Amino acid sequence: ESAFYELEFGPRTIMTLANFPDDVLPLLQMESLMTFEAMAYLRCDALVELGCYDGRALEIARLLNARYLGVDLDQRAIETLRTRIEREGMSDRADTVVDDILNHTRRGASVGSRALYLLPFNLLGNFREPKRLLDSLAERSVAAVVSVFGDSAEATRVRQSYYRRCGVQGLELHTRDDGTVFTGSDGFYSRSYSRACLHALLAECGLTVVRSASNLFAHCVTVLPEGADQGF
Amino acid sequence: TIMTLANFPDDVLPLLQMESLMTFEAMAYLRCDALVELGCYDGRALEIARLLNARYLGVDLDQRAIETLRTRIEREGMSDRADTVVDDILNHTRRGASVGSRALYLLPFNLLGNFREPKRLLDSLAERSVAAVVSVFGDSAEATRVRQSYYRRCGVQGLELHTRDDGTVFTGSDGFYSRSYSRACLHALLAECGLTVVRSASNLFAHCVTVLPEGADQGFG
Ligand SMILES: CSC[C@H]1O[C@@H](n2cnc3c(N)ncnc32)[C@H](O)[C@@H]1O
Ligand SMILES: CSC[C@H]1O[C@@H](n2cnc3c(N)ncnc32)[C@H](O)[C@@H]1O
């Protein structure tokens, strides 16, 4: 799992904004708005961004005066995030770890009292076995936001352009009933989801849907782990 | 050709994210039934209107970006609630038809800074808006570095950097102009144009403010 993101320039090629088709921005905006609103309503004092790169959700924590933890394998992107945290005077409230996401979710200390876990920008679709990641959220979180590419013809055309712009080698497209799977010879793996398939996967992993939003490109879901306390 | 993501350094994103969150929260709290995005490109605030079930009007002179937006509105089933106009921003604020009873006007991604006479635009907001969100580049060393890289990727000819106490000005031999703002200068300009700051946020790259036109009604619709 995540072999592609252990490559020196794996994360850089995928997360460089200049490599994004314009139509990626609506996916990122929907996910941002839903994370912001979820943290307020569910009284989360902490945001944990899995695959944060250079801190793509830091502004959400900033405008809510929430604690922030960014987790990524990419040392260079985390150093950019550390530099911004210091310059923003957020060192007391915002932290970073260079580590595997599953190392963090399985063994990492709690962040704040009521943490929301963000799985942004199709992170879940980059796991061949997404149930291992989803199952690990229960321990340290009272909520999660999961953002994935959808399976519309338009979404697939965006992804065809995006992954080639990123320079993914030997890119192949595999069409399935419930999503489109892209693979690369470099260990690249990215699937999209139908709304029904995403909802079914979440229910299977004991994650209750409280909010579900879709646009032409993406599905974004706010979930509560069953067994999570829902106090204030 | 300044709006395609292909031309954006990574450090542009925190500016876009801060103004999106402040526009979203302003629409909800101030009970705005319409979002009017000035310089909307391909509908960079459409998702805010969509997720609040608000009316939307995108104003831009980029007819390609507007046609992209019109198709997105149709495919999202938003035709009855979202529209576009290929118009000059000041012509729209001066003479354009009103949208909803409580419209919020968004001035995104340093639109105010890309105007040489910003007072004309700000003064025009008085009549037709109950609220506005204004997003500008700041004057940090990091903001100036990001802007230089951005304008270079946009292919501005004879790009020159002019240092000032209240914001860095970039010019080109092609007639390109864009200024950043200190927090103090932005607040002073808005006050001068009868716009009261109700929310003010800054990050390393940007200032974003929510304003009410003084004399604008503040009911619930
Ligand atoms: C938003 S999905 C892509 C981002 O997530 C990061 N990422 C992907 N898989 C992992 C993983 N297993 N552990 C940590 N970061 C990861 C990548 O380095 C990139 O910044
Ligand atoms: C965010 S500022 C840049 C955006 O605003 C648009 N724009 C700039 N000046 C004007 C103008 N005077 N009238 C309408 N749109 C404009 C550009 O086409 C671009 O999409």
Ligand code: NA
């Ligand atoms: Na995800």
Ligand code: NA
């Ligand atoms: Na959309």
